[PDB]
Amino acid sequence: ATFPPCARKMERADGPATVLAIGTANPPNVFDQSTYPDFYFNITNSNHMTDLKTKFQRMCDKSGITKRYMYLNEEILKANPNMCAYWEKSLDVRQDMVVVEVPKLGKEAATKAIKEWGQPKSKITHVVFCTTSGVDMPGADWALTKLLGLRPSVKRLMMYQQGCFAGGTVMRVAKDLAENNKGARVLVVCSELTAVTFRGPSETHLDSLVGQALFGDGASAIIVGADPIPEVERPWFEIHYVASNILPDSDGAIDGHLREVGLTFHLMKDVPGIISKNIGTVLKDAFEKVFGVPSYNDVFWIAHPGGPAILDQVEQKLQLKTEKMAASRQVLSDYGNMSSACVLFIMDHLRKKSVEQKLATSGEGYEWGLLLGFGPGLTCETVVLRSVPLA
Amino acid sequence: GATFPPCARKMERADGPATVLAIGTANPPNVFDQSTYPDFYFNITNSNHMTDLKTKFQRMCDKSGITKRYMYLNEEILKANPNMCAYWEKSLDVRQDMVVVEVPKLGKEAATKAIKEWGQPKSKITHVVFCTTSGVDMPGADWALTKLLGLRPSVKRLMMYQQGCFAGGTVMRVAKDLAENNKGARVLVVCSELTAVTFRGPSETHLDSLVGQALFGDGASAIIVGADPIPEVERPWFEIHYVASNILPDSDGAIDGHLREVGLTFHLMKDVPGIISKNIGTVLKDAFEKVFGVPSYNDVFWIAHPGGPAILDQVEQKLQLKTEKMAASRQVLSDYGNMSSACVLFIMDHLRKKSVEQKLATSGEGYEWGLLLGFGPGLTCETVVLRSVPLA
Ligand SMILES: O=C1C[C@@H](c2ccc(O)cc2)Oc2cc(O)cc(O)c21
Ligand SMILES: O=C1C[C@@H](c2ccc(O)cc2)Oc2cc(O)cc(O)c21
């Protein structure tokens, strides 16, 4: 039924997939969240909606966000009233920005990780590009290859319209890319701009208004590879286990539609409830596969900060000491919800703070840890990591 | 820069090559004869007065190598939406309404056929890869297919949106690493394309857009890919041995596609069949050196994405292939048109059945090795070196 077998024609690697470098970047315009409602209702000329604006200040005050970064600014928004309206034909100007600027922002981040990695660009064999902001053909992955000058033969994978969970998904993809091909070095970039989703306020769509309070811009990048060249490359985290789950009872919890008015956002279920109701069995299964088992308080946490209530209730139902979501709360506070890019921001922050504080490992002195993606589906991606030992 | 002491791989990997274990296809119900499509198209777009354009379109249609296409769009549907029959009126929203529903739906038909031939319970599918360039949504068509098929909540999904005609080669490259790096992985790969996003009226000043209206058709195909097959339970059809991607030289801008409020727009800004056929020699000889260190182009089997007849004709020409090499690729073009990422999988199915039916020695026309090729928008060339299985 088969021809005589032959040796693996493309040699695989032997160790686990490993993060060799992380780099991040953000657009230049900073918005303090405490005065965001004044700004938002000005630039959308909706100051007549007094009660709604009061509702919005509530949402921002409780978002857990201190500031956000945006490609958009007051100059750009006044030039584009159709994006300042709530529901106006827009999609073309929105595309015209993001198809250019998300690979640009991904380039900044990619270049920092490449600098930290320190090997020549030519040793990059795969590119994985992930975004929720706009689509084009050829894709941002191709544009990133052009902007960087990688080999024309890099193997590319373009991930469009993914949602907040794909920070976890890119780990699972790069895991197989790096481990099945010997010598592979995977450049992974998540780049997100809210220009597809900024819109004016509407008194009958408060869920859209939550989005306006939570979403910010940012790009994150990592270099993943197996069998790191000792004394030349530097490991920071190891990918050991990956899993994906559509949580029970979550049909229709979050939807997003790309329409003539841009990307629209729709909440219809208790997202933090469903996540914290089901996270225990998700992580129990994972820990059984991986170990046979350490506590939840004795691993490092990298969790996507969908909103504060997600981290709050996961912290509550799993009885985590408040220090566990710290690195995750810290990123949400400095940047808001950057969709897929958040977890690589948390991962970078976690390792840097581990070094500065001279802890035993790169995961706050713990050996094992979790990366968690949350989004539409409701979809949960689970990534069990190992850190590296540190001085 | 130290490392915790190594431990055995947490997730066991497979050892054999990724193997195709089943193929299924499906098409929408509405059939459009190619010879009289010009009469139909120019009438439904209210342009019978564009009389020189029509005769140019009849020329493209007759010289397209296509005998018929299948489409979700029918007559009735198109009159419901005059903004889609215009060349350039805003209509993305009615397009999205169609394809976010019908893309997963047609993929379900193909996937169910595939699972039936595969023979195993659908509960043993561990991975889903959904490939399309018809519309986007959150959650994606990959989520909807999981729902309509009733697969496990915990399938590892990969959602490929807005890909291009090369991605039928990309899914194979994607599924190769999924299957090989995960012992017992069984990957459902589905490509599903509907022209509802790309259909639009004619324009004298955009004959590239008009080329697409002559070549693009609808369809979906699905495969099951796994490594280390269960002996006597599963049946291997092709093995994936080597994959490669190249952006062809100086091909900057040859094929673009933009999703706008008027839908998906299509542009040819260079000589595409020339660029492919000028460089495919270099692409193929590198792949053959990698896997063989060596069979001749006429002694392998060919699954070539038939973006249009000129491409196949000029690859046939400059590699100097005996004309039965591209036979199977032309057959699918003739019977279906260009179905974007779904074509090479239709060709793979037709190739193996033609081989079984004519009692040849392997699933690949009697050859051990073969090529699957994708072409699209970098200009990107996807290369797959495959092996057949012996039949008797
Ligand atoms: O509507 C959006 C915008 C998107 C987004 C966030 C930040 C960014 O920078 C770019 C896009 O995030 C989302 C995530 C979802 O799960 C569902 C959604 O509808 C959206
Ligand atoms: O314009 C389109 C539409 C798409 C398509 C084909 C058939 C089908 O049924 C659905 C979509 O194929 C493409 C492939 C490309 O490389 C570039 C493009 O611009 C396009």
Residue numbers in the entry:
A (entry chain A): 7 to 298, 304 to 402
B (entry chain D): 6 to 298, 304 to 402
The authors write:
Chalcone synthase, a well-studied ubiquitous plant-specific type III polyketide synthases (PKSs), is the first key enzyme in the flavonoid biosynthetic pathway. The biosynthesis of flavonoids starts with the condensation of one molecule of p-coumaryl CoA with three molecules of malonyl-CoA through the catalysis of chalcone synthase (CHS) to generate naringenin chalcone. The crystallization investigation of CpCHS1 indicated that it has a highly similar conformation and shares a similar general catalytic mechanism to other plants CHSs.
Mutation of several residues around the catalytic pocket of CpCHS1 dramatically reduced the in vitro catalytic activity of the enzyme, experimentally supporting their functional roles in substrate binding.
